[PDB]
Protein backbone atom coordinates (compact mmCIF):
# COMPACT_ATOMS: atom_id res chain seq x y z
CA UNK A 1 0.00 0.00 0.00
CA UNK A 2 0.99 3.62 -0.45
CA UNK A 3 2.06 5.82 2.42
CA UNK A 4 -1.04 8.01 2.60
CA UNK A 5 -3.28 4.98 2.32
CA UNK A 6 -1.65 3.19 5.24
CA UNK A 7 -1.79 6.46 7.17
CA UNK A 8 -5.54 6.79 6.71
CA UNK A 9 -6.05 3.10 7.41
CA UNK A 10 -4.13 2.91 10.67
CA UNK A 11 -5.77 6.21 11.60
CA UNK A 12 -9.18 4.58 11.37
CA UNK A 13 -7.69 1.65 13.28
CA UNK A 14 -6.53 3.95 16.08
CA UNK A 15 -10.03 5.41 16.08
CA UNK A 16 -11.57 1.96 16.51
CA UNK A 17 -9.10 1.01 19.25
CA UNK A 18 -9.90 4.39 20.83
CA UNK A 19 -13.56 3.27 20.68
CA UNK A 20 -14.67 6.59 19.09
CA UNK A 21 -17.15 5.11 16.63
CA UNK A 22 -18.50 8.39 15.25
CA UNK A 23 -15.11 9.86 14.38
CA UNK A 24 -14.05 6.42 13.13
CA UNK A 25 -16.94 5.95 10.72
CA UNK A 26 -16.59 9.53 9.55
CA UNK A 27 -12.90 8.94 8.89
CA UNK A 28 -13.79 5.83 6.88
CA UNK A 29 -16.32 7.84 4.89
CA UNK A 30 -13.64 10.44 4.24
CA UNK A 31 -11.30 7.65 3.15
CA UNK A 32 -13.80 6.37 0.62
CA UNK A 33 -14.40 9.91 -0.62
CA UNK A 34 -10.66 10.52 -0.86
CA UNK A 35 -9.43 7.25 -2.39
CA UNK A 36 -12.39 5.91 -4.35
CA UNK A 37 -14.29 2.67 -3.93
CA UNK A 38 -11.96 0.51 -6.01
CA UNK A 39 -8.26 0.11 -6.67
CA UNK A 40 -7.14 -0.52 -10.23
CA UNK A 41 -4.95 -3.51 -11.00
CA UNK A 42 -4.86 -3.27 -14.79
CA UNK A 43 -4.98 -0.58 -17.46
CA UNK A 44 -4.35 -0.58 -21.19
CA UNK A 45 -2.04 2.21 -22.30
CA UNK A 46 -3.52 3.18 -25.62
CA UNK A 47 -5.26 5.89 -27.55
CA UNK A 48 -8.38 6.19 -29.63
CA UNK A 49 -9.86 8.50 -32.22
Amino acid sequence: LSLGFTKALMDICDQLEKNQTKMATYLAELLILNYGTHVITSVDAGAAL
Binding site: L1, T6, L9, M10, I12, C13, L16, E17, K22, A24, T25, Y26, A28, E29, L30, L31, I32, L33, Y35, G36, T37, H38, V39, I40, T41, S42, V43, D44, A45, G46, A47, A48, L49
Partner: protein, 290 residues
Protein backbone atom coordinates in the same frame (compact mmCIF):
# COMPACT_ATOMS: atom_id res chain seq x y z
CA UNK B 1 -32.81 27.05 -53.58
CA UNK B 2 -29.45 25.59 -52.54
CA UNK B 3 -28.67 24.53 -48.98
CA UNK B 4 -25.53 22.74 -47.85
CA UNK B 5 -25.29 21.49 -44.28
CA UNK B 6 -22.00 20.07 -43.03
CA UNK B 7 -21.17 18.55 -39.67
CA UNK B 8 -17.97 17.18 -38.22
CA UNK B 9 -16.99 15.76 -34.85
CA UNK B 10 -13.65 14.29 -33.92
CA UNK B 11 -13.37 12.89 -30.43
CA UNK B 12 -9.90 11.61 -29.63
CA UNK B 13 -8.38 10.44 -26.38
CA UNK B 14 -5.65 10.63 -26.35
CA UNK B 15 -2.88 11.57 -28.72
CA UNK B 16 -1.47 14.84 -29.98
CA UNK B 17 -3.95 17.75 -29.70
CA UNK B 18 -6.18 17.15 -32.69
CA UNK B 19 -6.78 19.65 -35.47
CA UNK B 20 -8.80 19.26 -38.67
CA UNK B 21 -6.07 19.30 -41.27
CA UNK B 22 -4.15 16.55 -39.49
CA UNK B 23 -3.36 13.40 -41.40
CA UNK B 24 -4.53 10.06 -40.16
CA UNK B 25 -0.80 9.36 -39.75
CA UNK B 26 0.94 12.22 -37.94
CA UNK B 27 -1.66 11.44 -35.32
CA UNK B 28 -0.20 7.96 -34.97
CA UNK B 29 3.50 8.75 -35.17
CA UNK B 30 2.89 11.37 -32.50
CA UNK B 31 1.52 8.84 -30.02
CA UNK B 32 4.94 8.11 -28.48
CA UNK B 33 3.92 9.40 -25.12
CA UNK B 34 0.40 10.87 -24.82
CA UNK B 35 -0.94 7.47 -23.88
CA UNK B 36 -4.22 7.21 -22.04
CA UNK B 37 -5.93 4.48 -20.05
CA UNK B 38 -8.50 3.29 -22.57
CA UNK B 39 -9.64 0.38 -20.43
CA UNK B 40 -9.16 -0.60 -16.81
CA UNK B 41 -10.04 -3.25 -14.27
CA UNK B 42 -9.45 -3.57 -10.56
CA UNK B 43 -10.80 -4.87 -7.29
CA UNK B 44 -12.90 -3.47 -4.45
CA UNK B 45 -10.55 -1.77 -2.04
CA UNK B 46 -11.89 -3.68 0.96
CA UNK B 47 -10.16 -6.65 -0.67
CA UNK B 48 -6.81 -4.89 -0.21
CA UNK B 49 -7.31 -4.37 3.53
CA UNK B 50 -5.82 -7.65 4.74
CA UNK B 51 -3.23 -8.39 7.44
CA UNK B 52 -0.64 -9.55 4.91
CA UNK B 53 -0.90 -6.37 2.84
CA UNK B 54 -0.80 -4.39 6.01
CA UNK B 55 2.29 -3.93 8.17
CA UNK B 56 2.50 -5.09 11.78
CA UNK B 57 -0.99 -4.68 13.20
CA UNK B 58 -3.38 -6.80 15.30
CA UNK B 59 -4.97 -9.61 13.33
CA UNK B 60 -8.65 -9.40 14.27
CA UNK B 61 -8.46 -5.61 14.36
CA UNK B 62 -7.75 -5.53 10.64
CA UNK B 63 -10.84 -7.71 10.19
CA UNK B 64 -12.77 -5.07 12.11
CA UNK B 65 -11.21 -2.37 9.94
CA UNK B 66 -12.04 -4.16 6.69
CA UNK B 67 -15.64 -4.63 7.77
CA UNK B 68 -15.92 -0.96 8.74
CA UNK B 69 -14.46 0.28 5.46
CA UNK B 70 -16.68 -2.10 3.50
CA UNK B 71 -19.79 -0.95 5.35
CA UNK B 72 -18.82 2.67 4.74
CA UNK B 73 -18.57 1.84 1.04
CA UNK B 74 -21.94 0.06 1.15
CA UNK B 75 -23.44 3.18 2.70
CA UNK B 76 -21.84 5.46 0.11
CA UNK B 77 -22.73 2.96 -2.60
CA UNK B 78 -26.48 2.35 -2.28
CA UNK B 79 -27.54 5.82 -1.15
CA UNK B 80 -25.41 8.83 -0.27
CA UNK B 81 -24.36 7.29 3.08
CA UNK B 82 -26.80 9.51 4.99
CA UNK B 83 -26.70 9.47 8.80
CA UNK B 84 -28.80 12.62 9.03
CA UNK B 85 -28.92 14.73 5.84
CA UNK B 86 -27.27 16.06 2.69
CA UNK B 87 -24.43 18.09 4.08
CA UNK B 88 -21.85 19.71 1.80
CA UNK B 89 -24.33 21.19 -0.69
CA UNK B 90 -25.40 24.55 0.78
CA UNK B 91 -23.68 23.94 4.13
CA UNK B 92 -26.03 26.40 5.85
CA UNK B 93 -28.81 24.30 7.45
CA UNK B 94 -27.33 20.80 7.13
CA UNK B 95 -25.88 18.24 9.53
CA UNK B 96 -22.30 18.23 8.26
CA UNK B 97 -20.33 15.75 10.33
CA UNK B 98 -21.00 13.24 7.53
CA UNK B 99 -20.45 13.53 3.77
CA UNK B 100 -23.38 13.90 1.37
CA UNK B 101 -23.82 15.76 -1.94
CA UNK B 102 -27.31 14.84 -3.19
CA UNK B 103 -28.41 18.12 -4.85
CA UNK B 104 -29.19 21.79 -4.17
CA UNK B 105 -32.08 23.07 -6.30
CA UNK B 106 -34.69 21.10 -4.31
CA UNK B 107 -37.84 23.17 -3.70
CA UNK B 108 -40.58 20.49 -3.84
CA UNK B 109 -41.20 17.24 -1.97
CA UNK B 110 -43.54 15.72 -4.58
CA UNK B 111 -43.69 12.03 -5.42
CA UNK B 112 -42.35 9.80 -8.19
CA UNK B 113 -44.33 11.19 -11.12
CA UNK B 114 -43.02 9.10 -14.00
CA UNK B 115 -44.25 8.70 -17.55
CA UNK B 116 -43.83 10.53 -20.86
CA UNK B 117 -46.64 11.33 -23.28
CA UNK B 118 -47.89 13.80 -25.89
CA UNK B 119 -50.09 14.21 -28.99
CA UNK B 120 -48.97 15.20 -32.51
CA UNK B 121 -52.02 16.56 -34.30
CA UNK B 122 -51.93 17.48 -38.00
CA UNK B 123 -53.63 20.64 -39.20
CA UNK B 124 -52.89 20.39 -42.94
CA UNK B 125 -50.68 18.32 -45.21
CA UNK B 126 -48.71 15.25 -44.07
CA UNK B 127 -45.16 16.33 -43.17
CA UNK B 128 -44.76 17.25 -39.52
CA UNK B 129 -46.61 14.27 -38.02
CA UNK B 130 -43.83 11.87 -39.01
CA UNK B 131 -41.13 13.64 -36.97
CA UNK B 132 -43.09 15.35 -34.18
CA UNK B 133 -44.51 12.00 -33.06
CA UNK B 134 -42.96 11.73 -29.58
CA UNK B 135 -45.13 8.77 -28.68
CA UNK B 136 -45.19 7.33 -25.16
CA UNK B 137 -42.52 4.78 -24.31
CA UNK B 138 -44.11 3.24 -21.21
CA UNK B 139 -46.92 1.77 -23.33
CA UNK B 140 -45.58 1.42 -26.88
CA UNK B 141 -48.26 3.75 -28.28
CA UNK B 142 -50.26 6.87 -27.45
CA UNK B 143 -51.32 6.07 -23.89
CA UNK B 144 -50.35 6.66 -20.30
CA UNK B 145 -49.09 3.78 -18.13
CA UNK B 146 -51.51 2.25 -15.61
CA UNK B 147 -51.60 4.27 -12.41
CA UNK B 148 -50.67 7.49 -14.22
CA UNK B 149 -52.63 10.32 -15.82
CA UNK B 150 -51.88 11.75 -19.28
CA UNK B 151 -52.68 15.31 -18.29
CA UNK B 152 -52.16 17.83 -21.08
CA UNK B 153 -48.74 19.46 -20.78
CA UNK B 154 -49.06 22.08 -23.54
CA UNK B 155 -50.67 22.58 -26.94
CA UNK B 156 -48.85 24.42 -29.70
CA UNK B 157 -48.90 24.88 -33.47
CA UNK B 158 -46.31 25.39 -36.20
CA UNK B 159 -46.42 26.43 -39.85
CA UNK B 160 -43.70 25.14 -42.18
CA UNK B 161 -43.58 24.76 -45.94
CA UNK B 162 -42.05 21.96 -47.97
CA UNK B 163 -42.10 21.70 -51.75
CA UNK B 164 -43.67 18.26 -51.87
CA UNK B 165 -43.21 15.41 -54.34
CA UNK B 166 -45.45 15.17 -57.39
CA UNK B 167 -44.92 12.62 -60.17
CA UNK B 168 -48.36 12.29 -61.76
CA UNK B 169 -49.46 11.13 -65.20
CA UNK B 170 -52.17 13.01 -67.09
CA UNK B 171 -54.08 11.80 -70.15
CA UNK B 172 -54.71 14.34 -72.91
CA UNK B 173 -57.81 12.89 -74.60
CA UNK B 174 -57.81 9.31 -73.21
CA UNK B 175 -55.61 8.17 -76.12
CA UNK B 176 -52.21 9.39 -74.97
CA UNK B 177 -51.03 10.40 -71.52
CA UNK B 178 -48.21 12.61 -70.29
CA UNK B 179 -46.51 12.54 -66.90
CA UNK B 180 -46.41 16.14 -65.67
CA UNK B 181 -43.93 16.11 -62.80
CA UNK B 182 -44.36 19.48 -61.09
CA UNK B 183 -43.54 19.76 -57.39
CA UNK B 184 -45.80 22.21 -55.59
CA UNK B 185 -45.49 24.47 -52.57
CA UNK B 186 -47.52 23.67 -49.46
CA UNK B 187 -47.62 25.19 -45.97
CA UNK B 188 -48.26 22.23 -43.73
CA UNK B 189 -49.26 22.77 -40.11
CA UNK B 190 -49.28 20.53 -37.05
CA UNK B 191 -50.73 21.22 -33.61
CA UNK B 192 -48.25 19.87 -31.06
CA UNK B 193 -50.17 18.70 -27.98
CA UNK B 194 -47.89 17.69 -25.13
CA UNK B 195 -49.51 15.61 -22.39
CA UNK B 196 -47.37 15.41 -19.26
CA UNK B 197 -47.64 11.98 -17.66
CA UNK B 198 -47.94 12.01 -13.87
CA UNK B 199 -48.79 9.29 -11.37
CA UNK B 200 -52.28 9.35 -9.90
CA UNK B 201 -51.44 8.02 -6.44
CA UNK B 202 -49.12 5.57 -4.70
CA UNK B 203 -47.09 3.70 -7.30
CA UNK B 204 -46.35 -0.04 -7.32
CA UNK B 205 -42.58 -0.33 -7.73
CA UNK B 206 -43.07 -3.12 -10.28
CA UNK B 207 -44.31 -0.67 -12.94
CA UNK B 208 -43.56 2.74 -11.44
CA UNK B 209 -40.32 4.40 -12.51
CA UNK B 210 -38.33 7.57 -11.85
CA UNK B 211 -36.52 9.61 -14.50
CA UNK B 212 -34.76 12.91 -15.11
CA UNK B 213 -32.98 15.14 -17.62
CA UNK B 214 -34.41 17.91 -19.83
CA UNK B 215 -32.72 20.33 -22.22
CA UNK B 216 -32.95 21.85 -25.68
CA UNK B 217 -30.38 22.20 -28.44
CA UNK B 218 -29.92 25.80 -27.24
CA UNK B 219 -30.50 25.54 -23.48
CA UNK B 220 -27.79 23.64 -21.63
CA UNK B 221 -28.66 20.61 -19.52
CA UNK B 222 -27.61 21.58 -15.96
CA UNK B 223 -28.51 18.02 -14.98
CA UNK B 224 -25.47 16.77 -16.89
CA UNK B 225 -23.85 20.16 -17.69
CA UNK B 226 -23.92 19.22 -21.37
CA UNK B 227 -26.18 19.19 -24.45
CA UNK B 228 -26.73 15.43 -24.66
CA UNK B 229 -28.07 12.54 -22.66
CA UNK B 230 -26.24 11.20 -19.60
CA UNK B 231 -25.24 7.55 -19.58
CA UNK B 232 -28.18 5.18 -19.29
CA UNK B 233 -30.68 7.69 -20.72
CA UNK B 234 -32.71 7.68 -23.91
CA UNK B 235 -33.33 11.32 -24.85
CA UNK B 236 -37.09 11.34 -25.39
CA UNK B 237 -37.73 14.34 -27.63
CA UNK B 238 -41.15 14.98 -26.10
CA UNK B 239 -41.19 18.68 -26.96
CA UNK B 240 -40.42 20.91 -29.95
CA UNK B 241 -36.72 20.96 -28.98
CA UNK B 242 -36.56 19.23 -25.58
CA UNK B 243 -35.00 15.78 -25.33
CA UNK B 244 -36.40 14.56 -22.01
CA UNK B 245 -33.85 12.00 -20.83
CA UNK B 246 -35.28 8.84 -19.30
CA UNK B 247 -33.92 7.00 -16.26
CA UNK B 248 -35.34 3.84 -17.77
CA UNK B 249 -33.04 1.73 -15.56
CA UNK B 250 -32.28 1.78 -11.84
CA UNK B 251 -28.60 1.26 -12.29
CA UNK B 252 -27.01 4.67 -11.85
CA UNK B 253 -30.35 6.47 -11.69
CA UNK B 254 -30.78 5.60 -8.02
CA UNK B 255 -27.94 8.05 -7.28
CA UNK B 256 -28.44 10.31 -10.33
CA UNK B 257 -32.22 10.75 -10.60
CA UNK B 258 -33.31 14.03 -8.97
CA UNK B 259 -36.90 12.81 -8.42
CA UNK B 260 -38.72 15.40 -10.51
CA UNK B 261 -42.36 16.29 -10.83
CA UNK B 262 -44.42 17.82 -13.59
CA UNK B 263 -45.80 21.21 -14.59
CA UNK B 264 -47.70 22.60 -17.58
CA UNK B 265 -47.05 25.99 -19.15
CA UNK B 266 -47.67 29.15 -17.15
CA UNK B 267 -50.92 29.56 -19.10
CA UNK B 268 -51.85 25.85 -18.93
CA UNK B 269 -52.63 24.16 -15.62
CA UNK B 270 -50.58 21.86 -13.39
CA UNK B 271 -50.75 18.23 -12.23
CA UNK B 272 -50.23 18.52 -8.47
CA UNK B 273 -51.40 20.45 -5.43
CA UNK B 274 -49.84 23.45 -3.69
CA UNK B 275 -61.39 17.46 -8.57
CA UNK B 276 -60.19 20.41 -10.66
CA UNK B 277 -60.09 23.43 -8.35
CA UNK B 278 -56.47 24.64 -8.51
CA UNK B 279 -54.51 26.16 -11.39
CA UNK B 280 -51.02 27.36 -10.41
CA UNK B 281 -47.54 25.95 -9.90
CA UNK B 282 -47.96 22.43 -8.45
CA UNK B 283 -46.45 22.92 -5.01
CA UNK B 284 -43.18 24.80 -4.81
CA UNK B 285 -40.32 24.76 -7.32
CA UNK B 286 -40.18 28.46 -8.11
CA UNK B 287 -39.62 29.48 -11.70
CA UNK B 288 -36.62 27.36 -12.63
CA UNK B 289 -36.71 27.86 -16.39
CA UNK B 290 -36.40 24.91 -18.75
Amino acid sequence: YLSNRTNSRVQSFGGVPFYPGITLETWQKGITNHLVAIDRAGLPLHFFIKPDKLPGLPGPLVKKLSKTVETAVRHYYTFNTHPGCTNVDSPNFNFQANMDDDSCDAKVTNFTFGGVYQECTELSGDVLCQNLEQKNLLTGDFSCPPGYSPVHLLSQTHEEGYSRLECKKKCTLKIFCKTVCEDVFRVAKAEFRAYWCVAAGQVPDNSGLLFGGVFTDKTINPMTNAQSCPAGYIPLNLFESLKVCVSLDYELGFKFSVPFGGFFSCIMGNPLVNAPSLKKCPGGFSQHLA
